[PDB]
Curated annotation (Swiss-Prot), chains A, B:
Name of this protein: Glycine N-methyltransferase
Effect on the protein of changing Y33F: Reduces affinity for glycine
Family of this protein: Belongs to the class I-like SAM-binding methyltransferase superfamily. Glycine N-methyltransferase family.
InterPro entries per UniProt: Gly/Sar_N_MeTrfase, Methyltransf_25, SAM-dependent_MTases_sf
Gene Ontology process terms (BP): glycine metabolic process; glycogen metabolic process; methionine metabolic process; methylation; one-carbon metabolic process; protein homotetramerization; regulation of gluconeogenesis; S-adenosylhomocysteine metabolic process
Main location: cytoplasm
Residues that coordinate or bind S-adenosyl-L-methionine: 21, 30, 33, 40, 64, 85-87, 116-117, 136-139, 175, 220
Length: 292, 292
């Protein structure tokens, strides 16, 4: 009989030694990635703020906090933001940010907490709800579908809709998987939210279970600036997976999470969307208003 | 030929989802363990505080920060303490605590940074060195010996000593491995630093490479209070390894770090220590006064 014997269990920590895979070549390059995506776009900044002001929103919940890029922007712009994420590895960066600028009143009232979409309703006190709830950056696409049916999906979206106060808003997006699925290719460097200063190639792998798109895996070969000899760069790789959400299905889901009592409109990239339009967007943004 | 596919690389994180092994059975029991190892003991508090004031120490550096328990106590007692650890999963606990109390002037001036003994000199600006440097809780034991020759142990101990200003202190301990090694057993719940409210069983495994104890692994079976049926307690386990440091060798190692210019004193559990003495200590605390 063969047996495996590890130093410490998967998941535990120990004073003095880095956590399990903190220094892998992958975690390394990944830090370059989540870093490189900070250079917020003008089109993006003007669009979100306008939408929010146009609706008189004020207290907003960011359910895909990440390193806190979209939240810091709402914070500096006077909104009363409460940010939550399920990933502690990414949450650590927002927390660092808050602490640095903690001397600023606006940053001292910024609430960052850990929450999970699947249990959101019990992790974050909605109270009367929020004005705008936001889930941008194709972040919902991370939640895989383990049970076959999209039960987990429906659960997260329902909870997410839960934090939206009546007459309130929900701004959630997804990448254009309708196009990725038909091309088999997900163009890199193609972003609308943040300008990428890093260079990368992207290998798109699509897993089709019996006959239904089940997952899209992306392999990022990032060119790291000065990891070569006479200045030349190096090439490290890392991988991430997403659930290929189609405009039609997602549209059914998000609406069904509101029980039908909602206002739905899907934007192309940042401009309106009408099926049949020559323009194929990289992102599909959904802005739902809670009418009941 | 075979091949294996992962959803995402080992070490990367994604917004809507929990980090890699954050919710494993072992990680869940482990959180309990570290959360039920904070009830500080009076002997410790008095001993530590006394030794520090007796030497008129004010700037203290905690290199085995952990959840901050040792440091919180020092910050609470007016000391100028900067805390570092190489484990984010743990550092996360001290950061949180600092925020919740960021309104108390003392807790506002508490520096919690990330650092590695191996590169301690590069991560922390000692300037002229700290008054005291502490590494309690048998935390040094965590650094394993990967090269065979305790090079890393030496490097770690060198950097650590260098943070000590002349006339300054260095308090560093390790468990009584001599006793463990000869008994093959490391008694559980037997702590001098904190009082454990948890009930646990411990299986000790000693890996003796050619003929030198090379490692000590402990499998903690914790009896979780209400994970059973009619109130009954559940039973879950986790493991952690340590490098078996013997008093004789660790003593050479620690002095070797100060280049010999130091005053060394090894304490029993908290009382002085003299070979052959009837009382067998659980811990060996080493206090080294840097004489230059």
């Amino acid at each position: 009989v063969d047996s495996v014997y590890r130093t410490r269990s998967l998941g535990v920590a120990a004073e003095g030694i880095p956590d399990q895979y903190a220094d892998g070549e992958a975690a390394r390059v990944w830090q370059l990635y989540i870093g490189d995506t900070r250079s917020r776009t003008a089109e993006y900044k003007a669009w979100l703020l306008g939408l929010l002001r146009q609706h008189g929103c004020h207290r907003v919940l960011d359910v895909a906090c990440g390193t806190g890029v979209d939240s810091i922007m709402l914070v500096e712009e006077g909104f009363s933001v409460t940010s939550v994420d399920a990933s502690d590895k990414m949450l650590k960066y927002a927390l660092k940010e808050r602490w640095n600028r903690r001397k600023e009143p606006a940053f001292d009232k910024w609430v960052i907490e850990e929450a999970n979409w699947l249990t959101l309703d019990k992790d974050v006190p909605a109270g009367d709800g929020f004005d705008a709830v936001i889930c941008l950056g194709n972040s919902f696409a991370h939640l895989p579908d383990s049970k076959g049916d999209q039960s987990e999906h429906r659960l997260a979206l329902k909870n997410i809709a839960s934090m939206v106060r009546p007459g309130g808003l929900l701004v959630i997006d997804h990448r254009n998987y309708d196009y990725i699925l038909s091309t088999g290719c997900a163009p890199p460097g193609k972003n609308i939210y943040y300008k990428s200063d890093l260079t990368k190639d992207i290998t798109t792998s699509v897993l089709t279970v019996n006959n239904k798109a089940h997952m899209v895996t992306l392999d990022y070969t990032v060119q790291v600036p000065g990891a070569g000899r006479d200045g030349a760069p190096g090439f490290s790789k890392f991988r991430l997976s997403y659930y290929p959400h189609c405009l039609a299905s997602f549209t059914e889901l998000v609406q069904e999470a509101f029980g039908g009592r909602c206002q739905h409109s899907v934007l192309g990239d940042f401009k309106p969307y009408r099926p049949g339009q020559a323009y194929v967007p990289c992102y599909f943004i959904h802005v739902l208003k809670k009418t009941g």
